[PDB]
Design a protein around this ligand. Structure first.
Ligand SMILES: CCC(C)(C)[C@@H]1CCc2n[nH]c(C(=O)NCc3ccc(S(N)(=O)=O)cc3)c2C1
Length: 294
């Protein structure tokens, strides 16, 4: 990439290295992800390429996709901070409820949009939620492993975070639905509120059991079909569901009601992004200006 002038290496994404770069003709600053090997993912590459038309205020724009000599470069709209960093910076005081609500509402608008266009994210986490000084928050890095793939390592020795993984994925479901994104966003909502990850598992089974210890071990009553899932084991311990007021104190009942709907075990009972937008929790939603230190 000579049309680009690397500013600095930002980090090492889930597929490759990420650089901050400047386009030497437009002068625009962007985030450039370099991915990687014989096979040339023709379908994977095409999948990604269609995301260029997925344009919405709460989705980080995918400016270009360039396949050239054993490498795939994704050029993205640049934002200066992510939610993981903002949450860490706000840990002592906590993010104000009006800002939590604004961010949740905006993320639901973005998901409602992608889901309406049959696009799933599949790996939502604070680190891929980008924020700016105007109070906006945007979804980035749509995995779409549906025709690309999602390994247990980014690309070179890097532990995959399972904290936001929906239970159906952990139980081996082969077909992900839009509900997996709602589950992840529910986990993120809880984390913004309590300032601690909801289910910080360090292995797939520890992740699954942390979910069961809090929400109760699922059964055919609350999740028809759960006992026939690929990785379901009759030997799973049977934990009682914890009182929900214990999980995200001191969130009010409007917030708790919405969270409970985003965390239903049955993907078919889990609330959609479009329906969540209409939840009473958003009756007084506004768009505060966060104080960001860049
Ligand atoms: C999520 C990774 C992906 C999918 C490649 C993102 C694709 C879209 C994107 N846009 N800007 C960035 C970006 O990286 N900015 C610089 C920056 C962001 C956060 C922080 S931080 N940890 O808040 O201090 C510091 C600098 C990315 C990365």
């Amino acid at each position: 990439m000579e049309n680009f002038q690397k500013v600095e290496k930002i980090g090492e994404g889930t597929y490759g290295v990420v650089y901050k770069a400047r386009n030497k003709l437009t002068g625009e600053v962007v985030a450039l992800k370099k991915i990687r090997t014989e096979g040339v993912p023709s379908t994977a590459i095409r999948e990604i390429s269609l995301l260029k038309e997925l344009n919405h205020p709460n989705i980080v724009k995918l400016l270009d996709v360039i396949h050239t000599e054993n490498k795939l470069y994704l050029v993205f709209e640049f934002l200066h901070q992510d939610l993981k960093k903002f949450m860490d910076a706000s840990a002592l005081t906590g993010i104000p409820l009006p800002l939590i609500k604004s961010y949740l509402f905006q993320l639901l608008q973005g998901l409602a949009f992608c889901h309406s266009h049959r696009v799933l994210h599949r790996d939502l986490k604070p680190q891929n939620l980008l924020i700016n000084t105007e109070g906006a928050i945007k979804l980035a890095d749509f995995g779409l492993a549906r025709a690309f793939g999602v390994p247990v390592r980014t690309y070179t020795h890097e532990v995959v975070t399972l904290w936001y993984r929906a239970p159906e994925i952990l139980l081996g479901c082969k077909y992900y639905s839009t509900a997996v994104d709602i589950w992840s966003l529910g986990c993120i909502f809880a984390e913004m509120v309590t300032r601690r990850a909801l289910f910080p598992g360090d292995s797939e089974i520890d992740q699954l059991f942390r979910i069961f210890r809090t929400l109760g071990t699922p059964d055919e009553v609350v999740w028809p079909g759960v006992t026939s899932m690929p990785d379901y084991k009759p030997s799973f311990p049977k934990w009682a569901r914890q009182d929900f007021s214990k999980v995200v104190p001191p969130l009010d009942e409007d917030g708790r009601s919405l969270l409970s709907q985003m965390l239903h075990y049955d993907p078919n009972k889990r609330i959609s992004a479009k329906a969540a937008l209409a939840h009473p929790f958003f009756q007084d939603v506004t768009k505060p200006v966060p104080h960001l230190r860049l």
